[PDB]
Design a protein around this ligand. Structure first.
Ligand SMILES: [Zn+2]
Length: 215
């Protein structure tokens, strides 16, 4: 549970090799910091470059290793915003082809577009699975699964126990969103914890909570 001084960044621990990163904008977004024997892996970066830089520098210093990869969960500014920083420092920015094309169309530098519907990644000792469940918060939103701990990073497809709204539904697919959440529940039937795009960590109850919000 290491927070910065002023800047708006904090890092909470869950496992011996998994932490949560939260950054303020008017809404505090979440992400993941995975400590592996080959380097640090992030599930999402931050709102912009300035925040993304501070974030990388904070964890590299703490864990004594380099951030080598980042997985972008969708193309919105809050997730793709620090792409320039990632690209110039040589950090691999993974994403689906869809997320990659949406970032470009919106004027952002593009991530790798290497991820499929189900992609199995392995970082030294760590194993990470990416999964596209269908449209919801956006047309491209994906979730991240850590099998070794049964942890799920839901991104903005999943709302926390504090969200009484669906948020910005401008690029959302409110109809398929319920089916997409069901795809996640069907694929991962035993979840230990769930990390929402915004809000506090939870469990399977976050998905059911999102389903109710979609009614
Ligand atoms: Zn979004």
């Amino acid at each position: 549970v290491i927070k910065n001084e002023t800047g708006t960044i904090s890092i909470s621990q869950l496992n011996k090799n998994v932490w949560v990163h939260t950054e303020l904008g008017a809404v505090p977004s979440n992400g993941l910091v995975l400590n592996t024997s080959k380097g640090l892996v992030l599930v999402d970066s931050s709102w912009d470059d300035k925040l993304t830089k501070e974030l990388i520098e904070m964890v590299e210093k703490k864990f004594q290793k380099r951030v080598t990869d980042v997985i972008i969960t969708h193309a919105h500014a809050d997730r793709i915003g620090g792409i320039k920083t990632l690209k110039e420092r040589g950090i691999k920015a993974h994403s689906t082809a869809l997320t990659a094309e949406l970032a470009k169309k919106n004027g952002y530098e593009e991530p790798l577009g290497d991820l499929q519907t189900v992609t199995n990644l392995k970082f030294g000792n760590m194993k990470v699975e990416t999964f596209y469940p269908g449209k919801g918060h956006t047309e491209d939103n994906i979730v991240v699964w850590l099998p070794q701990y049964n942890i799920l990073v839901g991104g903005c497809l999943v709302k926390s126990t504090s969200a009484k709204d669906l948020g910005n539904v401008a690029d959302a697919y409110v109809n398929e969103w319920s089916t997409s959440i069901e795809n996640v529940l069907k694929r991962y039937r035993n979840i230990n914890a769930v990390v929402p795009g915004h809000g506090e960590v939870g469990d399977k109850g976050l998905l059911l909570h999102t389903l109710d919000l979609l009614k």
